[PDB]
């Protein structure tokens, strides 16, 4: 056989770069507080999401 290894013989931090975490993008479709459509915009002055 001809198999391959990569050994991080240095500080394990250099392997620690890669693993753990892997979160989702938590937000989901936001609903506006007026017409209750799913939002298309976020107002710069309130940060409220809105549609129409």
């Amino acid at each position: 056989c001809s198999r391959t290894f990569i050994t991080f013989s240095d500080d394990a931090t250099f392997e620690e770069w890669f693993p753990q975490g892997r979160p989702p993008k938590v937000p989901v479709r936001e609903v506006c507080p007026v017409t209750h459509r799913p939002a298309l915009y976020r107002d710069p002055v309130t940060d409220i999401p809105y549609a129409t």
Binding site: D43, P44, Y50
Partner: protein, 424 residues
């Protein structure tokens, strides 16, 4: 006020003067006479407008002055700008950057129209603020409403390298091709002393921030040259690239046009290629037209010629109209008869109407009698010349004695040749 297009030779022909039954009228919208020829022209016009069959070819033949070019202009004005009508002379294919064959192919493809319809989602608004840290946020405004957007790196790189700035009326599409639309009218007084040559100040949009662009536009199939080079629309403004590869012309562009047609994003509208003075073509060009007419999506050819039995260019052979028999076999021939004492007078009357000249009926009689002896096309020129000679005489109507004032100044081919007894 005088504009670019003013009174030319065929200016009075505002259409082909036919009934709904394709029956020609004695005198109608600009055209006079040639009942047989105009009925035939109407029939081929109808098959142009149906568009169902490909590579049809018609030869308008006859003596100089019958109305072959006049009939072609009648067909071209009867047909709307929607259908491509390409007019060339047979002399225009004798190129230096192309061969005869490639230029003739390009003309053929110029006679096929393609109506693009394109349908794109757009974000448009005045930029209120941009922030960049790489990541940032963008505040867009329309007179109705305002929003934040979050920017990724490609969007950021095309904000900065575009030097978009607060106040710019910006426009962004899905699969962004961001283009700067305008400049805010508030960040103004900049032209207290100067503006950039590209800068504009018209105001920010209204309604929703997200909209849909419909765009419809007729290109000709010759848009093949839009894909013959790296940057290629330029070659539609300078004729540029010469023999673009057939391996991309006949399969890629036709295939993608068929795909557009099937999806519904395009539609071919086949038009007309009018080669005037077609006898100027070489046997190479004629024998090319042989196969070109057989092709799946040729336009309809119209040809005009005034030649008898004459030599074909590029040969020592003689044939009808000066074009080969194997190509006449592929044509329908429309002959044109000359005008009599009745129709010559009437087209002179039409030309006086077009040039806004008023003539005595005596002057009409004289001008017709002069035209029937030397040439039809000459009596048309005496109209304007007599108008001018009468304008300096403090007159208001062209008179019989004025036609003779012109008739001795500007002498016909006949009298001009007859006075070559001097042999310098």
């Amino acid at each position: 006020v005088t504009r670019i297009e003013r009174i030319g030779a065929h200016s009075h022909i505002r259409g082909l003067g036919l009934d709904d039954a394709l029956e020609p009228r004695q005198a109608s919208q600009g055209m006079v006479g040639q009942l047989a020829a105009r009925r035939a022209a109407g029939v081929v016009l109808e098959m142009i407008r149906e568009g169902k069959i490909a590579g049809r070819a018609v030869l308008i033949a006859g003596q100089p002055g019958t109305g072959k070019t006049a009939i072609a202009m009648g067909m071209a004005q009867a047909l709307g700008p929607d259908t491509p009508f390409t007019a060339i002379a047979g002399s225009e294919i004798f190129s230096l950057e192309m061969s005869k064959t490639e230029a003739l192919t390009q003309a053929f493809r110029r006679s096929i129209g393609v109506r693009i319809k394109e349908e794109t989602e757009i974000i448009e608004g005045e930029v209120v603020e941009i922030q960049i840290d790489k990541v940032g946020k963008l505040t867009l405004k329309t007179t109705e409403m305002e929003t934040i957007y979050d920017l990724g790196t490609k969007m950021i790189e095309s904000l900065t390298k575009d030097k978009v700035q607060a106040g710019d009326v910006i426009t962004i599409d899905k699969a962004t091709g961001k283009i700067s639309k305008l400049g805010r009218s508030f960040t103004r007084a900049r032209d207290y002393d100067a503006m950039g040559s590209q800068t504009k100040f018209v105001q920010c949009p209204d309604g929703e921030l997200q909209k849909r662009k419909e765009v419809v536009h007729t290109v000709s199939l010759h848009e093949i040259d839009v894909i013959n080079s790296r940057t290629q629309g330029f070659l539609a403004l300078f004729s540029g690239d010469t023999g673009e590869i057939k391996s991309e012309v006949r399969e890629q562009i036709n295939a993608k046009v068929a795909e557009w047609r099937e999806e519904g994003k395009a539609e071919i509208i086949p038009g007309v290629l009018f080669i005037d003075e077609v006898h100027m073509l070489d046997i190479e060009s004629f024998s090319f037209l042989n196969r070109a007419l057989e092709s799946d999506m040729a336009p309809v050819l119209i040809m005009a010629t005034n030649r008898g039995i004459t030599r074909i260019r590029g040969t020592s052979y003689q044939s009808p109209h000066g074009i080969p028999i194997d190509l006449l076999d592929r044509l329908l021939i429309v002959s044109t008869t000359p005008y009599s004492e009745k129709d010559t007078k009437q087209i002179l009357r039409i030309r006086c109407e077009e040039e806004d000249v008023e003539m005595s009926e005596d002057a009409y009689t004289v001008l017709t009698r002069i035209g029937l002896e030397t040439s039809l096309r000459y009596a048309i020129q005496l109209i304007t010349a007599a108008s001018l000679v009468c304008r300096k005489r403090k007159g208001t109507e062209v008179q019989v004695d004025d036609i003779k004032r012109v008739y001795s100044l500007f002498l016909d081919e006949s009298r001009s040749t007859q006075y070559m007894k001097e042999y310098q």
